[PDB]
């Protein structure tokens, strides 16, 4: 048979990769960071509480100015906040109220959103007449939009429940590159600092590293036991952290091509909904289903702090580009800025 | 001129919060529903009786606004996108009365999901006319797929239409008891199940959803006052 021959060849290649990964595992990140000074206790306080959303918030994204931020709620609204003054800059009504993701362009001229409508919508914020209007609707996904991130004003990467990722040309509206290989719902993606690579997390307990220009999967990472819900790149671009429904966060390295650290605890039996790094990458902030956000020491896997201000499931969190504040969105319709 | 920008930002924020107050009236008045079905269940005919990833249907009953949503181009994996509907008034679960065992497993997953624990389910046991013709004929016995049907008796609290024979009443009430065993096993007062024997072309389906939604909102208000 050929099916049994192609399957048996997969077990041979999987054993070869598992042995190549075990050869490089000379030490553990816990052993090399066993002597460094821990960060103590990180006790952040709620500085701002952004109210105005009517339903659960599913996503938020900071602007590149570390002041403005966009948030998406399932009431059908995109609200752009001025986190310094808590004033609302824009309130964009959406065609489909089932939004699941949002993005802020690096230039600050565009915001994106999408969800169960299987469409990524682009909204121009600097139009001449002054009314925020949809600039482009990117159709082509056969599943719900789960995440989207701007490469520039004319490029965007999307992840959907159709088990694929896509790179779009906003002016034309066409998929320039389609990233296939996942066998489950792709839930999150994270762009590298140079925007030449991005990692995706799906419901197959696997994470993949994609090349944006070449459109190929370079590395496939395993280790999680359940669906990966969140993913974030390390500040340098040589590592990334994942949050899954197995109540664990795991740190993966690109050059070592394997997992380095597990961030878990016996009393945590709820899935992770969001992950983010600090400016230096020392703190790994994770949002959980138990309404809490835990601040992990990324180098030592120690719990360094807890953010317990929300009354419902924390759905999204994000750190500013200057590292001054952390924003957290939750199903209780509130956004909180922590310092 | 920093005071000129800070006053222009407060004026724009006041105009936004004025529009958000109007949107809160429309949002809090509309009752959102999720229509879920199975393989060849008949939900499309109920929608017909009043690319795209989700379909919306708006209708009014006694001046009350209803917004029913039907899933379109989504894969058969539901464990992720079904969490979006944790705040709907009710989930309309249409079942064609082994596709029946598959609907029971799907009903169990919806009933016991941690995010849908506070969401009620309006159960439409559809295709009751086709169930009668199959039982009256007698070609395929339900006992071959449900061995407990041979030991089942029609409950005394049943309300059979005087036209149908006890064989059809015993068959359709056994299927209802299969779903009620799931609902009564984990029903602690957060949510309830409203079963109905429906046909896809019935004009009573819209009134059934209205009456069940009024019961759900009533029980929600009674729970806020801790009366029930």
């Amino acid at each position: 048979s050929e099916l049994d021959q192609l399957r048996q060849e997969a077990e041979q290649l999987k054993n070869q990769i598992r042995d190549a990964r075990k050869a490089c595992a000379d030490a553990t990140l816990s052993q090399i960071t066993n002597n460094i000074d821990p960060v103590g206790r990180i006790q952040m306080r709620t500085r701002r509480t952004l109210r105005g959303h009517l339903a659960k918030i599913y996503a938020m994204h900071w602007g590149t100015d570390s002041r403005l931020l966009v948030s998406a709620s399932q009431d059908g609204k995109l609200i752009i906040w001025d986190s310094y003054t808590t004033n609302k800059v824009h309130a964009i009504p959406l065609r489909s109220s089932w939004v699941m993701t949002c993005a802020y362009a690096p230039s600050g001229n565009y915001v994106a959103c999408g969800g169960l409508d299987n469409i990524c919508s682009i909204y121009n914020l600097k139009t001449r007449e002054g009314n925020v209007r949809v600039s482009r609707e990117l159709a082509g996904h056969t599943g719900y939009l789960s995440c989207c991130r701007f490469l520039d004003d004319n490029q965007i990467v999307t992840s959907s429940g159709d088990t694929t990722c896509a790179l779009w040309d906003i002016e034309t509206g066409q998929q320039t590159t389609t990233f296939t290989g996942h066998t489950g719902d792709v839930m999150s993606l994270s762009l590298a600092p140079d925007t030449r690579l991005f990692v995706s997390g799906a419901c197959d307990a696997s994470a993949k590293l994609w090349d944006v220009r070449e459109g190929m999967c370079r590395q496939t990472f395993t280790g999680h036991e359940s669906d990966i819900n969140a993913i974030c790149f390390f500040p340098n671009g040589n590592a990334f952290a994942t949050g899954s429904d197995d109540a664990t966060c795991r740190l993966f390295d690109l050059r070592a091509d394997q997992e380095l650290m597990t961030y878990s605890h016996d009393n945590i039996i709820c899935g992770i909904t969001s992950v983010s790094f600090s400016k230096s990458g020392r703190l790994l902030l994770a949002g959980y289903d138990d309404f809490n956000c835990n601040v992990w020491d990324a180098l030592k896997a120690d719990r360094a702090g807890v953010l317990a201000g929300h009354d419902n499931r924390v759905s999204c969190l994000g750190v500013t580009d200057d590292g001054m504040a952390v924003a957290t969105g939750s199903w209780d319709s509130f956004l909180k800025i922590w310092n | 001129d920093q005071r000129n920008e800070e006053k222009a930002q407060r004026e724009a924020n006041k105009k936004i919060e004025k529009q958000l107050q109007k949107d809160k009236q429309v949002y809090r008045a509309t009752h959102r529903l999720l229509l879920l079905g199975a393989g060849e269940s008949g939900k499309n005919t109920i929608v017909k009786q009043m690319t795209s990833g989700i379909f919306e249907t708006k209708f009014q009953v006694d001046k009350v606004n209803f917004h029913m949503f039907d899933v379109g181009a989504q894969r058969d994996e539901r464990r992720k996108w079904i969490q979006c509907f944790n705040d709907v008034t009710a989930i309309i679960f249409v079942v064609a009365s082994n596709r029946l065992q598959a609907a029971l497993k799907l009903f169990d997953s919806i009933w016991n999901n941690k995010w849908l624990r506070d969401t009620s389910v309006i159960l439409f046991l559809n295709k009751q006319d086709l169930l009668a013709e199959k039982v009256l004929a007698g070609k395929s016995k339900i006992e071959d797929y449900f061995p407990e049907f041979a030991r089942y008796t029609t409950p005394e609290d049943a309300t059979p239409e005087p036209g149908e024979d006890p064989r059809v009443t015993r068959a359709k009430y056994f299927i209802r008891d299969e779903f009620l065993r799931i609902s009564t096993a984990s029903g602690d007062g957060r949510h309830y199940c409203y079963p109905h024997f429906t046909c896809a072309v019935d004009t009573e389906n819209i009134r059934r959803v209205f009456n069940d939604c009024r019961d759900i909102i009533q029980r929600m208000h009674l729970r806020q006052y801790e009366l029930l």
Epitope: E225, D245, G271 | E77, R79, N113
Partner: nanobody, 128 residues
Framework: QVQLQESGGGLVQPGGSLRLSCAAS????????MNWVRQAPGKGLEWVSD????????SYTGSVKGRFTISRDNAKNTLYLQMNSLKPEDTAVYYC?????????????????????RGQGTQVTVSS
Amino acid sequence: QVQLQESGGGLVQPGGSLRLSCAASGFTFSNYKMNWVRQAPGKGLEWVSDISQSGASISYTGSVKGRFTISRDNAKNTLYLQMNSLKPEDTAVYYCARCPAPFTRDCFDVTSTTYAYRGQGTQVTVSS
């Protein structure tokens, strides 16, 4: 990596017995509810039996109740299915399916066309 490998299976006479074994690896076996699904020739995937984390709660589909017996050994990370008095209706590829999330009463999408936490399946044919 989550791995489910189904063993057993083969040709059996009508009325015979078979025992299927599911060797699990890559996850905490005690934290997940396990399932058995099968795909008959020219038919879709059909749920057969499931067992809770501890083994107390056990449910079967109607067509196999009284003939099939499911059991789990959390020490050996193995799922078992004892099939007695087999009929030609039981001819199918039997898959070992795991619930997606741990510590969950609900078990979604175990009978989906594409599901990650499911084995490749073992062939069971009942013919004379």
